[PDB]
Amino acid sequence: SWEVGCGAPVPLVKCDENSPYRTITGDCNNRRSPALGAANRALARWLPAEYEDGLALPFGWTQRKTRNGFRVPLAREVSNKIVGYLDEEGVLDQNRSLLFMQWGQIVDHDLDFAPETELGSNEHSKTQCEEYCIQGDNCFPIMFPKNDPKLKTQGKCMPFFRAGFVCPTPPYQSLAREQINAVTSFLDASLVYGSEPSLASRLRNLSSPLGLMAVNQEAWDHGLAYLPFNNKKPSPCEFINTTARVPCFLAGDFRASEQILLATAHTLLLREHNRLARELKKLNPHWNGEKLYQEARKILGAFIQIITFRDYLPIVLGSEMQKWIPPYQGYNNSVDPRISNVFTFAFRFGHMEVPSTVSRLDENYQPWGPEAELPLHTLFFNTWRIIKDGGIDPLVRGLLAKKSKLMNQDKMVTSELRNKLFQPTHKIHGFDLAAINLQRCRDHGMPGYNSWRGFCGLSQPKTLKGLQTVLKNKILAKKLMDLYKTPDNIDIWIGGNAEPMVERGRVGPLLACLLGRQFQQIRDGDRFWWENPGVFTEKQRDSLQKVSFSRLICDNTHITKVPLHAFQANNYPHDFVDCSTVDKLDLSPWASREN
Numbered sequence: 001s002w003e004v005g006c007g008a009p010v011p012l013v014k015c016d017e018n019s020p021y022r023t024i025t026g027d028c029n030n031r032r033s034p035a036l037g038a039a040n041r042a043l044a045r046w047l048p049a050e051y052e053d054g055l056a057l058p059f060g061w062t063q064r065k066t067r068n069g070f071r072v073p074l075a076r077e078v079s080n081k082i083v084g085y086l087d088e089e090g091v092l093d094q095n096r097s098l099l100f101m102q103w104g105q106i107v108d109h110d111l112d113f114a115p116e117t118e119l120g121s122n123e124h125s126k127t128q129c130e131e132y133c134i135q136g137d138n139c140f141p142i143m144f145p146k147n148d149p150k151l152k153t154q155g156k157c158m159p160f161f162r163a164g165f166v167c168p169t170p171p172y173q174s175l176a177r178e179q180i181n182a183v184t185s186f187l188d189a190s191l192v193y194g195s196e197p198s199l200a201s202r203l204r205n206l207s208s209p210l211g212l213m214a215v216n217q218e219a220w221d222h223g224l225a226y227l228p229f230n231n232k233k234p235s236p237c238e239f240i241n242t243t244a245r246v247p248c249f250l251a252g253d254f255r256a257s258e259q260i261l262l263a264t265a266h267t268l269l270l271r272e273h274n275r276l277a278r279e280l281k282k283l284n285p286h287w288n289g290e291k292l293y294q295e296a297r298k299i300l301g302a303f304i305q306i307i308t309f310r311d312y313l314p315i316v317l318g319s320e321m322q323k324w325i326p327p328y329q330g331y332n333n334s335v336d337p338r339i340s341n342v343f344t345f346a347f348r349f350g351h352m353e354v355p356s357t358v359s360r361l362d363e364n365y366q367p368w369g370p371e372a373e374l375p376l377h378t379l380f381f382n383t384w385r386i387i388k389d390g391g392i393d394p395l396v397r398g399l400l401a402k403k404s405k406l407m408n409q410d411k412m413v414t415s416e417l418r419n420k421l422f423q424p425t426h427k428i429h430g431f432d433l434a435a436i437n438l439q440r441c442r443d444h445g446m447p448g449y450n451s452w453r454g455f456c457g458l459s460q461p462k463t464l465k466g467l468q469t470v471l472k473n474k475i476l477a478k479k480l481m482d483l484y485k486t487p488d489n490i491d492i493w494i495g496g497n498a499e500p501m502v503e504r505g506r507v508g509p510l511l512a513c514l515l516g517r518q519f520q521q522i523r524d525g526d527r528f529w530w531e532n533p534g535v536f537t538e539k540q541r542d543s544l545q546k547v548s549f550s551r552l553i554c555d556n557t558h559i560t561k562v563p564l565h566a567f568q569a570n571n572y573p574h575d576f577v578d579c580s581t582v583d584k585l586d587l588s589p590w591a592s593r594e595n
């Protein structure tokens with residue numbers, strides 16, 4: 001008995017039923033329900049939202065209100081007591097390149113984004129939250145526990161604003177609050193091309209009829225392109241260094257400059273689009289701009305799908321991979337391709353894979369300069385270190401030769417993210433990504449850990465001893481129980497990441513189930529999946545089967561020494577080979593001999 005449904009923020013729908021290309025908004029993928037998987041729609045609810053008032057107030061919002069009879073702990077206290085650690089030694093993943101962490105942030109951004117509510121244009125609402133730490137409406141500040149060092153240097157709280165929700169923006173009252181997903185749910189390279197028509201056009205180079213994506217006209221990388229700058233001010237990339245005054249990049253996705261390796265990944269993707277656009281002109285000089293843009297986009301989207309499903313997921317899900325993501329059988333229109341709310345938290349497992357430093361390496365894969373290695377926090381919203389300090393080639397070698405952090409029950413999230421995160425508009429490198437993850441679980445009305453264990457057909461621990469056995473860790477189970485008196489109350493982000501990893505994977509059972517199911521739906525419910533009969537010719541598919549992340553690098557940098565398997569831990573020069581020994585993406589099958 002759940003209604004026809006609301007959908008006020010989203011406009012009209014008009015589908016061309018013969019189109020060979022995806023829309024920018026994601027609309028029209030599914031023919032029966034053309035809005036499914038479309039951006040700017042509510043995230044799916046795999047389980048009913050759980051709010052303190054059953055409708056919109058997050059747990060923890062009210063002092064006197066218990067969750068199952070107990071107060072929920074402060075997000076920052078959980079972070080300090082369970083998520084933090086001092087010693088970075090021995091914390092690295094002996095078998096995952098830094099590219100593994102990076103590819104995950106990429107895929108993530110291609111799939112979801114629940115932006116903060118916009119109630120700050122010419123408004124002190126945002127200023128007041130920060131300045132006076134007064135909880136109200138969309139201001140839900142993360143307060144400090146009594147013995148927190150930040151209380152001495154940063155004030156009473158870390159500001160936090162509730163995610164935006166569908167239908168109204170001034171309070172509604174009938175059904176549970178549902179947060180928005182601002183990007184397309186399909187793995188379609190929307191992080192490169194955008195999810196709104198407005199932005200999609202602006203990213204394009206219409207000036208010329210070659211199907212190209214716009215490039216920076218102010219800077220170049222030894223002749224190779226850079227993303228254009230986003231000239232919206234205030235710019236956080238300018239803020240972090242007023243001297244260099246280099247602004248953030250403009251990409252298909254809004255968070256592209258959050259950290260230098262992400263920006264780096266976006267640059268590689270753009271170059272790939274243009275290189276494909278140029279190669280297609282040569283094979284089909286008759287094709288117009290639109291035709292070239294779309295066919296290049298199509299090839300790039302398939303690239304991200306293949307790298308993700310064939311290379312990335314197997315080493316994330318490990319032994320659970322075949323269970324949740326059995327080999328492909330074809331497009332199924334009954335499958336819901338929408339990203340679920342819980343998935344946006346399950347995928348945050350990547351936060352425990354980010355290490356404390358980033359390196360620049362030269363062509364011999366040795367330190368590039370006197371400060372080749374830098375602390376991660378000095379790289380948030382840092383674009384000048386790319387434009388004014390070596391370009392992306394050096395950072396990409398670091399991605400290949402350096403390691404990801406390994407999840408560790410005693411060393412979860414690096415202090416660079418847990419104590420030194422920078423957030424636009426605020427002024428300091430003093431935030432905590434972990435605390436924020438937890439406040440956001442509550443903000444989104446996330447059911448607790450046992451609800452999800454149950455959802456996955458896994459036991460549901462009720463006692464310390466049960467939790468110990470599930471976590472296989474006495475001390476961590478003890479701290480969790482002391483913080484949350486019952487496993488029923490454990491926030492999903494933290495409970496899901498506390499479980500030991502499954503054989504050959506990098507996430508526990510619960511998370512493998514949640515991630516596994518979502519990715520299975522993402523593939524099975526995509527009318528444009530690269531392997532779906534009809535989307536690509538069969539000869540074109542034989543050419544796509546050859547793509548690799550190594551080749552993307554060779555084709556789009558001046559790097560000529562790459563590993564064959566980019567995600568595993570690789571050491572130079574042993575595990576490295578010359579680009580010639582690597583499969584190329586042969587584009588002949590795209591020659592349209594139409595005569």
Ligand code: HEM
Pocket residue numbers: 101102103104105108112113114115258259343344345347348349350351353354417433436437440
């Ligand atoms: C240096 C590395 C990274 C930094 C500094 C960073 C920072 C952030 C921040 C600030 C947010 C928004 C939090 C909020 O307000 O709720 C976020 C969200 C998120 N991040 Fe990370 N992140 C990093 C890497 C990763 C990685 C490697 C992954 C996955 C493999 C990942 C997955 C996610 C997901 C799913 C979200 C929620 C996105 C949404 O649906 O809104 N992140 N990140």
Ligand SMILES: *[C@@H]1O[C@H](CO)[C@@H](O[C@@H]2O[C@H](CO)[C@@H](O)[C@H](O)[C@H]2NC(C)=O)[C@H](O)[C@H]1NC(C)=O
Pocket residue numbers: 205207208212213214215216217
């Ligand atoms: C749009 O595409 C055109 C063609 O690639 C770009 O213009 C040329 O500009 C380059 C330097 O960027 C010069 O070699 C020539 O003066 C132009 N070439 C031709 C064939 O006309 C233009 O820069 C692109 N614009 C953006 C914003 O990316």
Ligand SMILES: *[C@@H]1O[C@H](CO)[C@@H](O[C@@H]2O[C@H](CO)[C@@H](O)[C@H](O)[C@H]2NC(C)=O)[C@H](O)[C@H]1NC(C)=O
Pocket residue numbers: 240241243244384388
């Ligand atoms: C801001 O960026 C500037 C400009 O790149 C940095 O200054 C450069 O750093 C060293 C000396 O400190 C030199 O090798 C460069 O040539 C400098 N250029 C100039 C114009 O000074 C500066 O260190 C950055 N500051 C911060 C806090 O990030």
Ligand SMILES: *[C@@H]1O[C@H](CO)[C@@H](O)[C@H](O)[C@H]1NC(C)=O
Pocket residue numbers: 332333334335336
């Ligand atoms: C299509 O999806 C539905 C619902 O997810 C599933 O139960 C059904 O088995 C699928 N149909 C086919 C032919 O695979």
Ligand SMILES: *[C@@H]1O[C@H](CO)[C@@H](O)[C@H](O)[C@H]1NC(C)=O
Pocket residue numbers: 095315565567568569
């Ligand atoms: C390292 O990981 C790869 C997957 O990229 C795997 O096939 C290989 O066997 C692993 N090796 C070790 C020693 O763990």
Ligand SMILES: c1cncc(Oc2cccnc2)c1
Pocket residue numbers: 254255256257258424
């Ligand atoms: C706003 C603009 N740019 C980056 C922002 O932070 C991130 C970073 C990574 C993922 N999500 C959000 C926020």
Ligand SMILES: [Ca+2]
Pocket residue numbers: 110111183184185186187188189190191
């Ligand atoms: Ca997408």
